[PDB]
């Protein structure tokens, strides 16, 4: 793969996307979930006492570039999953870019959901204002300051399991074979440490289901999570029924549905009919959109697997275009 190019693996039905990262000297390969909603790089380690037997664990003793650190860390994600441990320093190779002396977080403890998932840890791609430990420079910060990328951007392509899966992240560039037409520039609000954008409106056919709302681009979230009123409005347009747990039951037959269209900075971006269904279990389908009690939307994989995004940390801003498919 080209310089800074990281091929991704699509886990299950577009649940998450992970890539291989080499840490240490000589180094081990780790499968990390690439998360634009967080800013900590943590990995399962041999200091962990409740980690999965299937996870690959970082072993300080086997890295000649390991450097001890006296600080501890703890994190808790949006769904309550958590992990904790100690800080360390080592080299990280991201698509051939060798970041020297990156602060890495070794887990001593992790939630059962991490122990049973496909990840060895997470790579945070949010802004450095939300690292859990103050003074920690994120991998993007280090790629820029070490001169490993000449433009402070990363291009993101998330594939659809229905089309073969895959995905690809490119640090320092983007790939126009993955999208169609012209990219639309959208300003980013990073005041809360996330990639925040404003959606002008949302329509289903001729119906305006929502007026302008703010949301965050989160590759680490599976669904499109909307504020309660907006979610209900969307659900009514598709005849979806509320499961009372933040999810909806929708018809498995999407052949009759119109796309969920977002108007962003004057252009149209959509959630295609097929993406309206997340998963099918014993003939019942769970929708690709859900609800949460926040005033902003979490624009997750349901949306990102339909739209290519170029993330620019420098401005900050994003460039979006419909996926080529």
């Amino acid at each position: 793969a080209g310089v800074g190019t990281v091929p991704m693996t699509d886990y299950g039905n577009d649940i998450e996307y992970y890539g291989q990262v080499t840490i240490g000297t000589p180094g081990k390969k780790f499968n990390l979930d690439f998360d634009t909603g967080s800013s900590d790089l943590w990995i399962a380690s041999t200091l962990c006492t409740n980690c999965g037997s299937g996870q690959t664990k970082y072993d300080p003793n086997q890295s000649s570039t390991y450097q001890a650190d006296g600080r501890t860390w703890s994190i808790s994600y949006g769904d309550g999953s958590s992990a904790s441990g100690i800080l360390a320093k080592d080299n990280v190779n991201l698509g051939g870019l060798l970041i020297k002396g990156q602060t890495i977080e070794l887990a001593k403890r992790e939630a059962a959901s991490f122990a049973s998932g496909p990840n060895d840890g997470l790579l945070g791609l949010g802004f450095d204002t939300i690292t859990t430990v103050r003074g920690v420079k994120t991998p993007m910060d280090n790629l820029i300051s070490q001169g490993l990328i000449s433009r402070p951007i990363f291009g993101v392509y998330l594939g659809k399991a229905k089309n073969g899966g895959g995905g690809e992240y490119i640090f320092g560039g983007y790939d126009s074979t993955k999208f169609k037409g012209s990219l639309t520039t959208v300003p980013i609000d990073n005041s809360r440490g996330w990639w925040g954008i404003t959606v002008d409106r949302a329509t289903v056919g001729t119906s305006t289901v929502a007026s302008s709302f703010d949301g965050i681009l989160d590759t680490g979230t599976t669904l499109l999570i909307l504020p309660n009123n907006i979610a209900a409005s969307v659900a009514r347009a598709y005849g979806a029924s509320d499961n009372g747990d933040g999810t909806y039951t929708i018809s498995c037959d999407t052949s009759a549905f119109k796309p969920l269209v977002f108007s962003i900075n004057g252009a149209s971006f959509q959630v295609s009919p097929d993406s309206l269904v997340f998963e099918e279990f014993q003939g019942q389908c769970i929708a690709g959109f859900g609800y949460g009690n926040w005033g902003f939307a979490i624009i997750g994989d349901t949306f990102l697997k339909n739209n290519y995004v170029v993330f620019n940390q420098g401005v900050p801003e994003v460039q979006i275009a419909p996926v080529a498919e």
Partner: peptide, 5 residues
Amino acid sequence: PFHXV
């Protein structure tokens, strides 16, 4: 589903 902070 997952909900990454």
